[PDB]
Amino acid sequence: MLSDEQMQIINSLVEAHHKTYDDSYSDFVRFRPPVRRLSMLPHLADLVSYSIQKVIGFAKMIPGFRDLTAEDQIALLKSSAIEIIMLRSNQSFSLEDMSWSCGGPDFKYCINDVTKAGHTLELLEPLVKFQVGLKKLKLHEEEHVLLMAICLLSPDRPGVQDHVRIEALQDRLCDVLQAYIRIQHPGGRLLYAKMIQKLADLRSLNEEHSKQYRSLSFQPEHSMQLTPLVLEVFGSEV
Amino acid sequence: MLSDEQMQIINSLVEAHHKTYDDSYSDFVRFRPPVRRLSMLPHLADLVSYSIQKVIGFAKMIPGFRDLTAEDQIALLKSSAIEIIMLRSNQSFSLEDMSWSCGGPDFKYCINDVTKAGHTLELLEPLVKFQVGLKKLKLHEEEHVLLMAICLLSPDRPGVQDHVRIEALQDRLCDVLQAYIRIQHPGGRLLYAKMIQKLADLRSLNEEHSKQYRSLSFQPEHSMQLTPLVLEVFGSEV
Amino acid sequence: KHKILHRLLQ
Amino acid sequence: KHKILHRLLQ
Numbered sequence: 001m002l003s004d005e006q007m008q009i010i011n012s013l014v015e016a017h018h019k020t021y022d023d024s025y026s027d028f029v030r031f032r033p034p035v036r037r038l039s040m041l042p043h044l045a046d047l048v049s050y051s052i053q054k055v056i057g058f059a060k061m062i063p064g065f066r067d068l069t070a071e072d073q074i075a076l077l078k079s080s081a082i083e084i085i086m087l088r089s090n091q092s093f094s095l096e097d098m099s100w101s102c103g104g105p106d107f108k109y110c111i112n113d114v115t116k117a118g119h120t121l122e123l124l125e126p127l128v129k130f131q132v133g134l135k136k137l138k139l140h141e142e143e144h145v146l147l148m149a150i151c152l153l154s155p156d157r158p159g160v161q162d163h164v165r166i167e168a169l170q171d172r173l174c175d176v177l178q179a180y181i182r183i184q185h186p187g188g189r190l191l192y193a194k195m196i197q198k199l200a201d202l203r204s205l206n207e208e209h210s211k212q213y214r215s216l217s218f219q220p221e222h223s224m225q226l227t228p229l230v231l232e233v234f235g236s237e238v
Numbered sequence: 239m240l241s242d243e244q245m246q247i248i249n250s251l252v253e254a255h256h257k258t259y260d261d262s263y264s265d266f267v268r269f270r271p272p273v274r275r276l277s278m279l280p281h282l283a284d285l286v287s288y289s290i291q292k293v294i295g296f297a298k299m300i301p302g303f304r305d306l307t308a309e310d311q312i313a314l315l316k317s318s319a320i321e322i323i324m325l326r327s328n329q330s331f332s333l334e335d336m337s338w339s340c341g342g343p344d345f346k347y348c349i350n351d352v353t354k355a356g357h358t359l360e361l362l363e364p365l366v367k368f369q370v371g372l373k374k375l376k377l378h379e380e381e382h383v384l385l386m387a388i389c390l391l392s393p394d395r396p397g398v399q400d401h402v403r404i405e406a407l408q409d410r411l412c413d414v415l416q417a418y419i420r421i422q423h424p425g426g427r428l429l430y431a432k433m434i435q436k437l438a439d440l441r442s443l444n445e446e447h448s449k450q451y452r453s454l455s456f457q458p459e460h461s462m463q464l465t466p467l468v469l470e471v472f473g474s475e476v
Numbered sequence: 477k478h479k480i481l482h483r484l485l486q
Numbered sequence: 487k488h489k490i491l492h493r494l495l496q
């Protein structure tokens with residue numbers, strides 16, 4: 001059975017996600033419009049930039065994150081932002097469409113749209129297979145939120161200083177997730193291990209995306225289409 | 239009477255402007271849309287960024303600019319870009335509307351729109367008075383183009399190294415403008431001196447705009463709405 | 477460094 | 487420095 005402090009963690013984590021993920025997607029109309037040359041890079045740059053702001057907002061409400069040093073907060077967000085974006089995007093992904101559908105057909109993204117923003121199938125094929133296998137997991141909101149917080153608070157990320165403290169935070173969160181699945185998820189005997197595998201998959205997607213981001217950001221005619229926030233977060237500064 | 243080399247300068251300068259100013263404004267639909275908090279800063283950031291690219295393209299076709307060192311090219315563009323944007327924008331300005339009208343009502347900019355991008359009447363009132371007095375000048379395309387090239391190739395700008403060479407280029411261009419007005423502009427006895435006054439006005443508008451840009455760029459929640467190109471060009475790096 | 481990140485992290 | 491400017495200036 002779950003403890004009261006374990007459930008407060010779940011509560012504040014669910015509230016943090018509802019405050020930072022807007023299921024109406026009505027904010028997307030103020031991105032630079034999509035074009036279907038890298039015709040999709042402006043719109044996807046704005047989507048990712050907007051998403052980074054929401055991840056930062058989510059992190060700030062993870063119990064204990066706000067108490068990390070600013071350098072550790074930055075270090076965790078610089079290494080994990082792209083992974084949390086891939087995880088959180090599962091909420092718009094459709095198994096039927098094999099795409100991310102954000103309200104309108106203007107904001108429905110195919111693999112092919114992402115190729116017109118500079119990425120290759122070396123990234124997009126593992127990414128779509130990741131989305132589908134994650135979507136088939138049929139996670140409760142509690143579990144999806146916990147996995148994002150676990151991903152964010154991983155200590156084996158370059159740049160972290162207070163390894164012990166953030167690993168203790170991640171331990172707490174993992175213990176919550178394991179208990180939640182056991183008590184509250186019928187037939188989830190294998191679910192915790194599957195979700196931990198997904199964390200491994202995200203590392204691999206992070207590395208490929210970082211490879212392909214370096215190729216973009218070294219071409220100023222493309223990097224100039226990015227936003228300041230994207231340049232800061234995906235950049236290589238320490 | 240005008241010489242053949244003087245008229246080749248006029249020719250290549252008019253061609254350079256037609257290649258870099260699109261009177262259809264159809265590119266404006268891919269800016270982040272206008273909102274009427276700094277609701278207009280995203281759209282105006284994209285307008286200015288787009289405009290900087292066109293000024294760079296215009297400069298590259300000024301006779302002699304391309305032969306300057308890259309550092310002198312950069313130095314001239316960093317100090318003059320905002321002035322050339324103010325000059326070139328006269329082509330969309332309407333005396334009847336007291337605004338810049340770029341095709342559609344979506345892309346019609348009031349003084350009030352520019353205040354919702356962070357600027358104050360300390361800038362906008364002199365700027366609008368500048369536009370109207372420039373518009374009343376009723377310049378020929380030849381003269382408008384020459385004034386932009388003269389403005390760009392001014393040597394009294396911080397950072398310039400080959401002062402002698404770019405002043406010789408500006409002398410050539412001024413001699414062209416003086417001859418053109420005398421031969422080709424009926425009743426323009428006083429026009430050359432008025433246009434030189436406008437160059438002085440632009441310095442004053444440059445200084446105020448730079449003051450107000452510093453206040454924006456020191457607030458990261460606003461500067462993050464700018465583009466990489468705007469940050470580079472209006473930035474203080476050398 | 478990380479001007480925007482610092483700002484957003486409050 | 488001036489990465490984009492250099493690129494655009496060719």
Ligand SMILES: C=C1/C(=C\C=C2/CCC[C@]3(C)[C@@H]([C@H](C)CC#C[Si](C)(C)C)CC[C@@H]23)C[C@@H](O)C[C@@H]1O
Nearest residue numbers: 044045048051085086088089092100109114117213
């Ligand atoms: C972002 C989200 C959403 C969808 C996510 C998508 C579809 C578009 C392409 C993206 C973004 C990938 C690429 C490879 C990542 C990149 C990049 Si780029 C061109 C700026 C170097 C990673 C996740 C992909 C919508 C909604 O669920 C909110 C969520 O947050």
Ligand SMILES: C=C1/C(=C\C=C2/CCC[C@]3(C)[C@@H]([C@H](C)CC#C[Si](C)(C)C)CC[C@@H]23)C[C@@H](O)C[C@@H]1O
Nearest residue numbers: 282283286289323324326327330338347352355451
């Ligand atoms: C730009 C152009 C046009 C209009 C120019 C305008 C109207 C909008 C506000 C602007 C841009 C001013 C402000 C004060 C300048 C700024 C800034 Si800001 C918010 C990125 C720090 C300077 C010139 C002003 C349209 C067309 O004629 C092409 C031309 O090129």
